Structures are given as C-alpha cells and as structure tokens.
Amino acid sequence: SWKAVRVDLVVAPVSQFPFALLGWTGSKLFQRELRRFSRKEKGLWLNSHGLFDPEQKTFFQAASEEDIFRHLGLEYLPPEQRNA
DNA sequence: AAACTATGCATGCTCTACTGCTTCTGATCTAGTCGACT
Helix, strand or coil: CCCCCCCCCCCCCCCCHHHHHHHHHCCHHHHHHHHHHHHHCCCCEECCCCEECCCCCCECCCCCCHHHHHHCCCCCCCHHHCCC
16 A cells, blocks of 8 residues: 655755755744844845845855854754744 | 632630749747745
C-alpha cells in the first residue's frame, strides 16, 4: 500500500542559505512579526532571499543564521521556541 | 457578263494559366487581475 504526503522543495544559494532557512523554520506569525519589526524598528527589509538596507544600497548577508538575529538587535532563539 | 460559292483574314470574346503586388487573417509573445501555494 501507499499514502499521499505533501512535500515542498526549495533551492537557494549558499550565500542566501541562512536567510531561506530562517524564513522556512519560523512560524507564519513569527515570520510576519519579524519582518514587521525589521522594517519598522530597524528600517531594514527582510525576506526569504536576504536583508536589505534602503538607505545604503548594499546587502547585509552573513555566513550564519544567528547573525540575522545578532544584527537586528534581538536575542537569539532556537527553532523550537519560534512557535508563534 | 452576272450570280453564287470559296477561301482568307481580321477583331472582339472567353478561358486557363502564369507572375507580381496589396490587404486580410491566424499563430505567437506579455500586463493585469484573480486565485493557488509556501
């Protein structure tokens, strides 16, 4: 016998790997809140591809996912604690 | 010598193909709107 299970596949470059990983691990509400905080408080645009500064037209990529929280002035969280 | 017949020719008409130019039509590429998803 067999069963039908939904599977989602995403391909991203190594440079953008942490950004996509963060975008997909966190909950929908958590991602929305993080994006709103980034754009309103820190004034930076956050999406699944990278972090952008409208003032200085240069990407703020980083080699580790924790750098995203580090540069946004937020304490680091693990995926288990990002449940909305 | 005159009447009838014969050939001969020309021109307008009809059709079928042939070629080239012009216009219409069918196939192929994108903006917007709604919807689906992560």
